[PDB]
PDB file of C-alpha atoms and ligand atoms in Angstrom:
ATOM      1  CA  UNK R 121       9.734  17.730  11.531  1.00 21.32           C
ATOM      2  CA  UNK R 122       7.395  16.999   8.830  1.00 22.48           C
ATOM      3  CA  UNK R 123       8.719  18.989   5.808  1.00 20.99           C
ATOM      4  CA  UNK R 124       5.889  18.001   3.378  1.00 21.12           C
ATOM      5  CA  UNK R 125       3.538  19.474   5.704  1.00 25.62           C
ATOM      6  CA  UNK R 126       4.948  22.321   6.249  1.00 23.84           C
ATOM      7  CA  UNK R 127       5.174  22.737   2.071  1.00 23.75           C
ATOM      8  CA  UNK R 128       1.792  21.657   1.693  1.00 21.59           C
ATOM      9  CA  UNK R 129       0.707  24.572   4.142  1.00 22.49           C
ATOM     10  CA  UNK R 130       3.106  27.063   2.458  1.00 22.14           C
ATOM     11  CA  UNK R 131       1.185  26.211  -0.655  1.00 19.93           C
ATOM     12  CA  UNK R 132      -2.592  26.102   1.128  1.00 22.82           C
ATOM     13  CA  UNK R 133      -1.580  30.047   2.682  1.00 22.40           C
ATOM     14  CA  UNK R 134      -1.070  31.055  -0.769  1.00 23.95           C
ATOM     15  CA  UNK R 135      -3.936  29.792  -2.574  1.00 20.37           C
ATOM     16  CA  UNK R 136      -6.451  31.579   0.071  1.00 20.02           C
ATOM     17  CA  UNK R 137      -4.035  35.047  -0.060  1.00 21.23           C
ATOM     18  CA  UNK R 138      -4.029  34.773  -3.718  1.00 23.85           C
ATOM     19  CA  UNK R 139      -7.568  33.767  -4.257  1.00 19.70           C
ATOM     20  CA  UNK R 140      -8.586  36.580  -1.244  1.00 23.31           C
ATOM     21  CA  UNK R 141      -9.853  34.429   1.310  1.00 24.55           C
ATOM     22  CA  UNK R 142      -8.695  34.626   4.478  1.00 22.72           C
ATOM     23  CA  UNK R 143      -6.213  32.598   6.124  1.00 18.80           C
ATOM     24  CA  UNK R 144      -7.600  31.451   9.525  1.00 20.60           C
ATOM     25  CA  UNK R 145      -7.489  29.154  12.298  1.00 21.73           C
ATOM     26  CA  UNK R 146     -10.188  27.578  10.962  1.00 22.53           C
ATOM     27  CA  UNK R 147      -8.710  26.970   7.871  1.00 21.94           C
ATOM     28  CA  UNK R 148      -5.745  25.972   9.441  1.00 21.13           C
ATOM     29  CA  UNK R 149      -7.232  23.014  11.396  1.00 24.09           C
ATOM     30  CA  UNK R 150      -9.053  22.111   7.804  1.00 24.19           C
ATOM     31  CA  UNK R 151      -5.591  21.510   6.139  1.00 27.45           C
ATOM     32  CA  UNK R 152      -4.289  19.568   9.006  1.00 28.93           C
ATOM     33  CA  UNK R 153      -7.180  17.519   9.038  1.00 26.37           C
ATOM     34  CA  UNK R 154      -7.107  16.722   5.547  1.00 26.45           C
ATOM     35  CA  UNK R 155      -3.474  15.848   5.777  1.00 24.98           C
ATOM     36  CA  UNK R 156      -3.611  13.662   8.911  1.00 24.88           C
ATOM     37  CA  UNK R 157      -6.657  11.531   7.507  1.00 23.10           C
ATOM     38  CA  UNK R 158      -6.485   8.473   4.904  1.00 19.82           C
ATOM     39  CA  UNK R 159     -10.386   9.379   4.243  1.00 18.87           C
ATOM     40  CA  UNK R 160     -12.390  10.773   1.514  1.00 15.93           C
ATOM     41  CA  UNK R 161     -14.803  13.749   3.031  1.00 14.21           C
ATOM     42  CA  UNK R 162     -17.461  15.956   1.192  1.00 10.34           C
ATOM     43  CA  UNK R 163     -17.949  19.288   2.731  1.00  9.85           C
ATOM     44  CA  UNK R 164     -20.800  17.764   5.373  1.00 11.90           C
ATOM     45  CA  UNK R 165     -18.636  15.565   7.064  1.00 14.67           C
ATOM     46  CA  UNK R 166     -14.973  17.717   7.095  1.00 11.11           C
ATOM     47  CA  UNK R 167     -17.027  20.440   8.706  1.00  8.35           C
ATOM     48  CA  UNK R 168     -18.254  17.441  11.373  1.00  9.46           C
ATOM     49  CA  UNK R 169     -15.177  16.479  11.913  1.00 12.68           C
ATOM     50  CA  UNK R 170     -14.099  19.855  12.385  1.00 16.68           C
ATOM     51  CA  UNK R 171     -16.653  20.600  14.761  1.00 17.27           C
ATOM     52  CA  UNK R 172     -16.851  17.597  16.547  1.00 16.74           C
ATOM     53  CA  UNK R 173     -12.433  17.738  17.398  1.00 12.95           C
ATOM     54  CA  UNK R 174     -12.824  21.478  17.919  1.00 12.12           C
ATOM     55  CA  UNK R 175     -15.820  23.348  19.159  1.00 12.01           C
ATOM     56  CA  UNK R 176     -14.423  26.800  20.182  1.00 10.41           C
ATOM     57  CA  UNK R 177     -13.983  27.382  16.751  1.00 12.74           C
ATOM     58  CA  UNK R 178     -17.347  27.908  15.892  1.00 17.03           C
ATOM     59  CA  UNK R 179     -16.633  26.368  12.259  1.00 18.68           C
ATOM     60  CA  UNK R 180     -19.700  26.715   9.877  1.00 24.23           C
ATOM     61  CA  UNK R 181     -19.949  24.759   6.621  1.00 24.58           C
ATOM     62  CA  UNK R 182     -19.715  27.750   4.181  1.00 21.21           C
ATOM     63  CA  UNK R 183     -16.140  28.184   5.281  1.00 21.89           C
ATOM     64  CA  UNK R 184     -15.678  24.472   4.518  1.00 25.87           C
ATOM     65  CA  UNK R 185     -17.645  24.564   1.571  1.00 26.91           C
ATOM     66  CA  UNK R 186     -15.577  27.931  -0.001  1.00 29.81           C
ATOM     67  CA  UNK R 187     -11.766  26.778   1.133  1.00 31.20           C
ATOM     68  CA  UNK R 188     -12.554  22.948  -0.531  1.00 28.43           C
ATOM     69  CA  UNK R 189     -13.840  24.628  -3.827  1.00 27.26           C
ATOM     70  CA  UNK R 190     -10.967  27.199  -3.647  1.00 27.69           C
ATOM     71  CA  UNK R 191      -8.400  23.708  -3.036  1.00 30.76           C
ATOM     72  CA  UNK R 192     -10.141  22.083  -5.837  1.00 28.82           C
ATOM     73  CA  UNK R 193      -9.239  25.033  -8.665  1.00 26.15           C
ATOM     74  CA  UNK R 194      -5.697  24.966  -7.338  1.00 26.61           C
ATOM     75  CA  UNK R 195      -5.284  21.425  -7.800  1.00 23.85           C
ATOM     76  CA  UNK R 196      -4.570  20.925  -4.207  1.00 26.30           C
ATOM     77  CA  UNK R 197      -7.408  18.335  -3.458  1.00 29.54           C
ATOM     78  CA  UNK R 198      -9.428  16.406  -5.654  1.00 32.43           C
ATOM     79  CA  UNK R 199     -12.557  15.027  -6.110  1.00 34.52           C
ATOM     80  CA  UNK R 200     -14.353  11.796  -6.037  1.00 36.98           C
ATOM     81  CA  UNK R 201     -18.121  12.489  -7.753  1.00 38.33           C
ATOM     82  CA  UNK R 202     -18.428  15.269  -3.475  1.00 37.81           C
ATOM     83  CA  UNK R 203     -15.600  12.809  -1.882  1.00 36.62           C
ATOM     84  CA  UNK R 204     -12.483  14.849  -1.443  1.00 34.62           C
ATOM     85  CA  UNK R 205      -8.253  14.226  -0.766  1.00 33.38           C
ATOM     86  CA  UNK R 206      -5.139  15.896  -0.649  1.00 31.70           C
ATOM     87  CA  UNK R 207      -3.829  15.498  -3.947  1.00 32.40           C
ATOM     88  CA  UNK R 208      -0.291  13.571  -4.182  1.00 32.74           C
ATOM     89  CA  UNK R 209       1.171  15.190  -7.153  1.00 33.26           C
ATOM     90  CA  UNK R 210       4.840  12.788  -8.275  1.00 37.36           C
ATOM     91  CA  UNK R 211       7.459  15.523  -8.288  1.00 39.13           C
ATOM     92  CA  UNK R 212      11.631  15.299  -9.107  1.00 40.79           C
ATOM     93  CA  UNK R 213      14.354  15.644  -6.436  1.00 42.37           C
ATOM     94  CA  UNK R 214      17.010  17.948  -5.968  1.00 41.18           C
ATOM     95  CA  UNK R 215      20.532  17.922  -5.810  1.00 40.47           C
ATOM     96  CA  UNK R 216      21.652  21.774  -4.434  1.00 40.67           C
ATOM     97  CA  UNK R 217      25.379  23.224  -4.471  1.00 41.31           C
ATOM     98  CA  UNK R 218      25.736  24.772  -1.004  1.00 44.65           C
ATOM     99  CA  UNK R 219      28.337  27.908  -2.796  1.00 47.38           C
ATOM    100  CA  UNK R 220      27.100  28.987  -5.998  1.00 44.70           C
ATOM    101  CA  UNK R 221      23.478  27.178  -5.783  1.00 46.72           C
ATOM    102  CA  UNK R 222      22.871  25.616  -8.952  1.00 45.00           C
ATOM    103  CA  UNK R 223      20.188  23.001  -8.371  1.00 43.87           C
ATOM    104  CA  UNK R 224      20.040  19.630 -10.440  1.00 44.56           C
ATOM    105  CA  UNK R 225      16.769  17.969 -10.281  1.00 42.95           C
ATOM    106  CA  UNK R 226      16.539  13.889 -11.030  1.00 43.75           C
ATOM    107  CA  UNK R 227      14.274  11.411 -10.476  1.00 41.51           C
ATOM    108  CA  UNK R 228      16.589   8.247  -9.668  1.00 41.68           C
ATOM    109  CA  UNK R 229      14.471   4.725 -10.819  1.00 42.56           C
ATOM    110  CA  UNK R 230      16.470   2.400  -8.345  1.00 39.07           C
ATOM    111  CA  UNK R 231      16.176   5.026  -5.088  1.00 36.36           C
ATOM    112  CA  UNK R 232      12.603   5.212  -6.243  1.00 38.29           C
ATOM    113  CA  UNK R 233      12.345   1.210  -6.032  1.00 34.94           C
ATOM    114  CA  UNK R 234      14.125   0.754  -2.615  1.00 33.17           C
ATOM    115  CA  UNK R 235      11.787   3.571  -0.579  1.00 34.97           C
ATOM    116  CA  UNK R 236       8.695   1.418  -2.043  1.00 35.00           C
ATOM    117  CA  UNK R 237      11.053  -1.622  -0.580  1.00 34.11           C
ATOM    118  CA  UNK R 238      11.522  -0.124   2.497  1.00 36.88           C
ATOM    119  CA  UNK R 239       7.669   1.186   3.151  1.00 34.79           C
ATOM    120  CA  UNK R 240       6.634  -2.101   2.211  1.00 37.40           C
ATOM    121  CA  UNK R 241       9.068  -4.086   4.488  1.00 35.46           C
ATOM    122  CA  UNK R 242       7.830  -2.049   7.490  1.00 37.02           C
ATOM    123  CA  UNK R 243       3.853  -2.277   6.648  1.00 37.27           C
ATOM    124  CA  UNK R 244       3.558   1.271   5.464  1.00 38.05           C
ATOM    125  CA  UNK R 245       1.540   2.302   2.259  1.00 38.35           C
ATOM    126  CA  UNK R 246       4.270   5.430   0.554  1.00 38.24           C
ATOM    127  CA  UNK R 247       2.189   8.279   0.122  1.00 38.63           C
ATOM    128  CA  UNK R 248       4.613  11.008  -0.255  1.00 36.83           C
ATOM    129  CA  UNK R 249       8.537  11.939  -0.054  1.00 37.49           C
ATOM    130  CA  UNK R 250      11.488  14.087  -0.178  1.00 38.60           C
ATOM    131  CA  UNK R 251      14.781  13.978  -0.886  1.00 41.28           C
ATOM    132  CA  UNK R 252      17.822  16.978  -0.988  1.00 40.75           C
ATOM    133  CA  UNK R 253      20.936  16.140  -1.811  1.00 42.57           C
ATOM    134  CA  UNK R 254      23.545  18.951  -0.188  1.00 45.09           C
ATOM    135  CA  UNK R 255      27.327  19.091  -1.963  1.00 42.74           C
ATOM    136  CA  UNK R 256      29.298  21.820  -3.590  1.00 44.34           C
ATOM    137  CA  UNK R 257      29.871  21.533  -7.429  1.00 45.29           C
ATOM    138  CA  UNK R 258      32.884  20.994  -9.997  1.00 46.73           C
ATOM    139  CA  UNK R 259      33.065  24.475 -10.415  1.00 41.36           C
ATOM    140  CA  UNK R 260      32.829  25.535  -6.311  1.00 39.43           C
ATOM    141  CA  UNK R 261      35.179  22.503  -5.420  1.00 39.15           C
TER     142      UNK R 261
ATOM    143  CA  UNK I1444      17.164  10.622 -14.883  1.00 40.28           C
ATOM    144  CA  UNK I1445      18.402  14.204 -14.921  1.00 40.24           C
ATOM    145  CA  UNK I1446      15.777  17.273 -16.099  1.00 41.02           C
ATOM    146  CA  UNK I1447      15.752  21.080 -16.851  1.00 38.84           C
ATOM    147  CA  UNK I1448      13.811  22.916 -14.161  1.00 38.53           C
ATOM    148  CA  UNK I1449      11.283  27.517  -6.594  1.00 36.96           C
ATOM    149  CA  UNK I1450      13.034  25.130  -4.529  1.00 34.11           C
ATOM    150  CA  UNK I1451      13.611  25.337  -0.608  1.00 35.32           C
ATOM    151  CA  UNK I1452      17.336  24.198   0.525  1.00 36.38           C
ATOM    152  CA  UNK I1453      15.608  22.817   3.583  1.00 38.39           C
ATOM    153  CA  UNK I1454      18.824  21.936   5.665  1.00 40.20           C
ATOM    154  CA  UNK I1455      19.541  25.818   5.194  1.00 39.78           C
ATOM    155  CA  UNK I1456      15.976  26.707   6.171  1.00 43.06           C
ATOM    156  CA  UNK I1457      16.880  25.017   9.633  1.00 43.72           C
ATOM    157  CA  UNK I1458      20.242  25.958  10.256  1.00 39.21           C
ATOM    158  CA  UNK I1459      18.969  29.970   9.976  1.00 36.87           C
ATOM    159  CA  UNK I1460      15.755  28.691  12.682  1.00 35.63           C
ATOM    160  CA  UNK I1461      18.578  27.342  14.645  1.00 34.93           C
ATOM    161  CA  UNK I1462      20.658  30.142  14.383  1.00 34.46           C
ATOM    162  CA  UNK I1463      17.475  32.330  15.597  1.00 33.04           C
ATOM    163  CA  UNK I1464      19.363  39.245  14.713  1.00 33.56           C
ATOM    164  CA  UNK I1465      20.549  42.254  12.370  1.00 32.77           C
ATOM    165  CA  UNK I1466      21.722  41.872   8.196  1.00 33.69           C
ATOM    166  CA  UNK I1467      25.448  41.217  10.280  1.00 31.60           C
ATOM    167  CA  UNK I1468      24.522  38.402  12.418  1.00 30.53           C
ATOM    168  CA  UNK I1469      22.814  36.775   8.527  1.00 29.92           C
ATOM    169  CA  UNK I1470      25.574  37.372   6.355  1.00 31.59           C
ATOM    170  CA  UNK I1471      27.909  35.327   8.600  1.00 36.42           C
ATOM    171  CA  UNK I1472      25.687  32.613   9.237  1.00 40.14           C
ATOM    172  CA  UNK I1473      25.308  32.795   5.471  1.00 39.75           C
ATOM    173  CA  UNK I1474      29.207  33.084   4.618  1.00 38.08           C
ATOM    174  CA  UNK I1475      30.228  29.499   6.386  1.00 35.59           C
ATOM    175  CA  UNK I1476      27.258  27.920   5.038  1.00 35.71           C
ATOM    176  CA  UNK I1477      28.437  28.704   1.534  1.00 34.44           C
ATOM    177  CA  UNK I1478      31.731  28.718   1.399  1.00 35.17           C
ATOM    178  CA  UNK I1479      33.948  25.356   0.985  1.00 38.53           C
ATOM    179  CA  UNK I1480      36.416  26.741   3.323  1.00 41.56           C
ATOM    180  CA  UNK I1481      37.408  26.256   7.093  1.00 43.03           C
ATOM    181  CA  UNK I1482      37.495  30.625   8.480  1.00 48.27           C
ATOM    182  CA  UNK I1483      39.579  31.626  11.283  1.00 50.72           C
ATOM    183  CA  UNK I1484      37.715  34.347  12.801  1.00 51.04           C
ATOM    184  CA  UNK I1485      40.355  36.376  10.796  1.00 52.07           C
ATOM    185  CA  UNK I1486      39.691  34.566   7.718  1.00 54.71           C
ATOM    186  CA  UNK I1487      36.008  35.301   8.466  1.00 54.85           C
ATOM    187  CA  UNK I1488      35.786  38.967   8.629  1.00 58.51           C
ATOM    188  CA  UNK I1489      38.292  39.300   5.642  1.00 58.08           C
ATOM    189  CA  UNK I1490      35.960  37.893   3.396  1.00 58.05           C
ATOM    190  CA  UNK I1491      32.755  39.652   5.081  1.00 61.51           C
ATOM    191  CA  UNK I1492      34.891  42.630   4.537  1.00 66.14           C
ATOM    192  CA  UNK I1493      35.622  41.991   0.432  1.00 65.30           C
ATOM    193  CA  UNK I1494      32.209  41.084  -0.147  1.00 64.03           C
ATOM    194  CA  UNK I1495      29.461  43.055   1.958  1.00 65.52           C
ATOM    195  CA  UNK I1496      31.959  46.109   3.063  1.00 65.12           C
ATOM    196  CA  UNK I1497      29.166  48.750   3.622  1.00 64.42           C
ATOM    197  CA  UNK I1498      27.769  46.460   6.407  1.00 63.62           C
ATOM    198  CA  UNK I1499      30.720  46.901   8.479  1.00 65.52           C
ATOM    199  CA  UNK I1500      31.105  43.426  10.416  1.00 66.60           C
ATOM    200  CA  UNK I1501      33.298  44.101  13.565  1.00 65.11           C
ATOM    201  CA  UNK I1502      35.745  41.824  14.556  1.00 65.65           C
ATOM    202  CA  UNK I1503      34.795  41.724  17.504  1.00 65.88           C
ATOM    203  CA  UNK I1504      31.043  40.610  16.375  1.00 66.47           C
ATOM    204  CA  UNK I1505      32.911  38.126  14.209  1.00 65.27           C
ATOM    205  CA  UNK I1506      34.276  36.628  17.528  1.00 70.33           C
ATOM    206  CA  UNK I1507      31.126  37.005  19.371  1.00 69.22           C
ATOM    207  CA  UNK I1508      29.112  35.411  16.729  1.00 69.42           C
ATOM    208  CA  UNK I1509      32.016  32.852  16.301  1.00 69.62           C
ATOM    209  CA  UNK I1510      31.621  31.874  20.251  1.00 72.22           C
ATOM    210  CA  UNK I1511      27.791  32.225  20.126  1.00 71.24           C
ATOM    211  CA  UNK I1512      27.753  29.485  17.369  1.00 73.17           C
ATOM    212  CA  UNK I1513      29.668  27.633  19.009  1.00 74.46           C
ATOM    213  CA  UNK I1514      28.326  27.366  23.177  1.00 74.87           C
ATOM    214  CA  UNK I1515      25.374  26.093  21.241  1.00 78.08           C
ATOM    215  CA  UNK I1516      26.634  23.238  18.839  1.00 79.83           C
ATOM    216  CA  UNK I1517      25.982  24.725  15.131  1.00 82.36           C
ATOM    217  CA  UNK I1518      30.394  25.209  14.647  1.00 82.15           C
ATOM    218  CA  UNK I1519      33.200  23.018  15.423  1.00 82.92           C
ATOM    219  CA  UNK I1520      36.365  23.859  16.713  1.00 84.80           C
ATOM    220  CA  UNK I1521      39.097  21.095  15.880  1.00 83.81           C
ATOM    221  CA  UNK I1522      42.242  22.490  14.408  1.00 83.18           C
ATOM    222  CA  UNK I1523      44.042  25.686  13.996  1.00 85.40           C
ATOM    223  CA  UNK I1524      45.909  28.120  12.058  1.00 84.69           C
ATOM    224  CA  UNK I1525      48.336  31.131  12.182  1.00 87.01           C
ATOM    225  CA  UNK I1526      45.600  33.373  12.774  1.00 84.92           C
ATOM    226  CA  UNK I1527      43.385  31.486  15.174  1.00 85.64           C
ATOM    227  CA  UNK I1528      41.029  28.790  15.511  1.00 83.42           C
ATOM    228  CA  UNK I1529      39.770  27.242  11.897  1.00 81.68           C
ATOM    229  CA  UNK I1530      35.842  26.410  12.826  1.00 82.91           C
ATOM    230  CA  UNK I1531      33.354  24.335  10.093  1.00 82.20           C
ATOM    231  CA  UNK I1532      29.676  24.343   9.974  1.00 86.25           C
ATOM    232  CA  UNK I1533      29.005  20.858  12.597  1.00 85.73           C
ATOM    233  CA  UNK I1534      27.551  18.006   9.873  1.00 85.51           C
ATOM    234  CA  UNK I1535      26.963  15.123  11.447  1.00 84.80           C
ATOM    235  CA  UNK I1536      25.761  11.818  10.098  1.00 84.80           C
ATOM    236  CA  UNK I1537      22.496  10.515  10.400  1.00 86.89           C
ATOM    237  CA  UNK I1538      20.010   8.349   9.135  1.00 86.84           C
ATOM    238  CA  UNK I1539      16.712   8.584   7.527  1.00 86.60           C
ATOM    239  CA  UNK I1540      13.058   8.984   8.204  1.00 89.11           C
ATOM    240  CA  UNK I1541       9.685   6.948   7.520  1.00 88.96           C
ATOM    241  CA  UNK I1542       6.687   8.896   9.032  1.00 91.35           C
ATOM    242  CA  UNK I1543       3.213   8.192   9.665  1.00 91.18           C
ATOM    243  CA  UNK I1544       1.300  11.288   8.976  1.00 90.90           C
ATOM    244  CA  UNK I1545      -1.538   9.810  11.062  1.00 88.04           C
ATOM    245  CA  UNK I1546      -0.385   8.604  14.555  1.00 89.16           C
ATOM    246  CA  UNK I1547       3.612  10.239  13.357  1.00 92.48           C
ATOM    247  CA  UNK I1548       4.878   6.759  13.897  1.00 95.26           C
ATOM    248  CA  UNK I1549       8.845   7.615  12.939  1.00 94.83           C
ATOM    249  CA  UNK I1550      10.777   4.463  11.251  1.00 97.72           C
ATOM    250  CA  UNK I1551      14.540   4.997  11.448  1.00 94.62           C
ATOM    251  CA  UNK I1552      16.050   3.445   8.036  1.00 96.19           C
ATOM    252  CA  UNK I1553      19.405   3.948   5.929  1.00 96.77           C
ATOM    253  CA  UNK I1554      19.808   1.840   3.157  1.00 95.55           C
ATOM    254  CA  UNK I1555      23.362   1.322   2.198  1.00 95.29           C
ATOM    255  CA  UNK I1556      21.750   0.674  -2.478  1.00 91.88           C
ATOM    256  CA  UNK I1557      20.328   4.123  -1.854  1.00 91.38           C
ATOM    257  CA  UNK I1558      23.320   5.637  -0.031  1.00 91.20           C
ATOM    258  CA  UNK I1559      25.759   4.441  -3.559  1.00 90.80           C
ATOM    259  CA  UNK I1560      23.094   6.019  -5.698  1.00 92.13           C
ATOM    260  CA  UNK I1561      23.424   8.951  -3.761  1.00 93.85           C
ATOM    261  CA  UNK I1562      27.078   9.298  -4.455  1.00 94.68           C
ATOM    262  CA  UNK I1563      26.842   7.933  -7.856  1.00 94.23           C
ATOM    263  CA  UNK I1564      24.813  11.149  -8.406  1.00 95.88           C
ATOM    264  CA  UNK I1565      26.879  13.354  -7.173  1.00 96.18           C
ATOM    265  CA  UNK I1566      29.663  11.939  -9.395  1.00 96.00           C
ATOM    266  CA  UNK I1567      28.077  11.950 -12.258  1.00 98.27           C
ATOM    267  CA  UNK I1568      27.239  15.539 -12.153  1.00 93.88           C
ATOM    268  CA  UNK I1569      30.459  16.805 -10.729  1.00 92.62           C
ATOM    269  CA  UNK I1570      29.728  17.739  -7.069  1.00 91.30           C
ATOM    270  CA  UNK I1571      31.175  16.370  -4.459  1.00 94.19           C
ATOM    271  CA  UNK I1572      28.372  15.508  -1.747  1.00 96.40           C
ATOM    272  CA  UNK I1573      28.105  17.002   1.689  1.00 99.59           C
ATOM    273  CA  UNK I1574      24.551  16.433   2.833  1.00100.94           C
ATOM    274  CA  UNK I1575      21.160  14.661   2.302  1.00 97.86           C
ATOM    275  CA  UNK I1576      17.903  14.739   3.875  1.00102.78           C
ATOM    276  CA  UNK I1577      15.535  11.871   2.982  1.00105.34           C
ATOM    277  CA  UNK I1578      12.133  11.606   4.663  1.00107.13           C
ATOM    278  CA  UNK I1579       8.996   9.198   3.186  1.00106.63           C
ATOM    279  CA  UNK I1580       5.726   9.743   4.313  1.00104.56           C
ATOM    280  CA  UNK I1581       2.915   7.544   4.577  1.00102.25           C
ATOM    281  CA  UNK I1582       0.134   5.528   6.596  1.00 98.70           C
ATOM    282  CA  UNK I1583       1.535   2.827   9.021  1.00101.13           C
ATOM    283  CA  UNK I1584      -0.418  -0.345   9.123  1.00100.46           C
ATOM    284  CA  UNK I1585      -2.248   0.423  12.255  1.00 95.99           C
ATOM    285  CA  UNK I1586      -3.704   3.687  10.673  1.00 98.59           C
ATOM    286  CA  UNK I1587      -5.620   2.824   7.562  1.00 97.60           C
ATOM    287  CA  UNK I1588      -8.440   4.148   6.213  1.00 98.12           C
ATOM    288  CA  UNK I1589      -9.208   6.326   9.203  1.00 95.85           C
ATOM    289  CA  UNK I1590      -9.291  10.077  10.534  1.00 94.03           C
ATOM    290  CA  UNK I1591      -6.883  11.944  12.138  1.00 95.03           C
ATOM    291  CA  UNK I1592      -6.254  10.201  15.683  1.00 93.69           C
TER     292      UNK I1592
HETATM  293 CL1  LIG O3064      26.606  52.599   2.846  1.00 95.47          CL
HETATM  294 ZN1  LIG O3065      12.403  10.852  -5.437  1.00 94.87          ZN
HETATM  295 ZN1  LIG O3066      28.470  25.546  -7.246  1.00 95.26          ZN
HETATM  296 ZN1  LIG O3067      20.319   8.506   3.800  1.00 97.58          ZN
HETATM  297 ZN1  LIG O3068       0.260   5.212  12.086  1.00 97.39          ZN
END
């Protein structure tokens, strides 16, 4: 599976729970929608879209309108002004001992380089990653 | 680069999602995923018993649980000792993972520079290396600049 998207809604659940909206199916098929697009929307044309893919959810813009602006504080989306995305925030990878679990983070230059390789060599634009590295450490083995 | 630092062990998060019981049936799934050590079923409840005695573990759930995860796929078998059976935690290898997040075009990759650096890293910080998951994410070049498809 996708494990970024399954993060990034993690992380969406939390900001509406901790900022006492609602978590919804509506809401729901925002983040998705947001996450499966490569374009910019402002709050008239995600609650189109919205509308338009799914009409039994009787979307209205004021959800829209409260869940971007809620996204926005968090740092989750950002905006073009109007004109939102997903942010992409660069992050670290992790290196986890499977015993004791200490965690190492690292950010390795030439792994960075050949993923860019690789999504270039197959037509792709990068846009996001992960990487776990699983052992056990000097002190566990 | 190495830096000071909540982080998800994701190939945990699956095995217990695979696995799906009771605080029991957790604590052994738990055990073999963090020890460095092939049980016996034996071996198993021994150290269940050491560490979490007021849960009780039967050895007879240790077998059950033992056979359980193991009809499915999640333990191997191969080898034995005095006291039975030694089983490990299956590990296979595999490659990794390119996804569109538009159409979910999946590229299979595994490139052998990144797969050194990988075990340089784990060398250089002690830890022998058992694991990795590596998935990039991105737009393919059929789904730019458009919606959700
Ligand atoms: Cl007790
Ligand atoms: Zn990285
Ligand atoms: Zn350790
Ligand atoms: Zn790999
Ligand atoms: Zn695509």
């Amino acid at each position: 599976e996708n494990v970024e998207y399954d993060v990034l809604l993690e992380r969406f659940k939390k900001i509406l729970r901790q900022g006492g909206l609602k978590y919804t199916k509506q809401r729901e098929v925002l983040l998705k929608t947001l996450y499966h697009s490569d374009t910019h929307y402002t709050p008239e044309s995600l609650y189109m879209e919205i509308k338009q893919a799914e009409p039994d959810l009787n979307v209205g813009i004021a959800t829209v309108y409260r869940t971007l602006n809620l996204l926005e504080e968090a740092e989750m989306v950002t905006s073009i002004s109007k004109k939102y995305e997903l942010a992409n925030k660069p992050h670290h990878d992790h290196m986890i001992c499977k015993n004791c679990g200490k965690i190492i983070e690292f950010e390795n230059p030439i792994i960075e380089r050949q993923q860019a390789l690789i999504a270039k060599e197959h037509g792709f634009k990068l846009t996001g990653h992960l990487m776990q590295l699983y052992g056990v450490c000097g002190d566990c083995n």
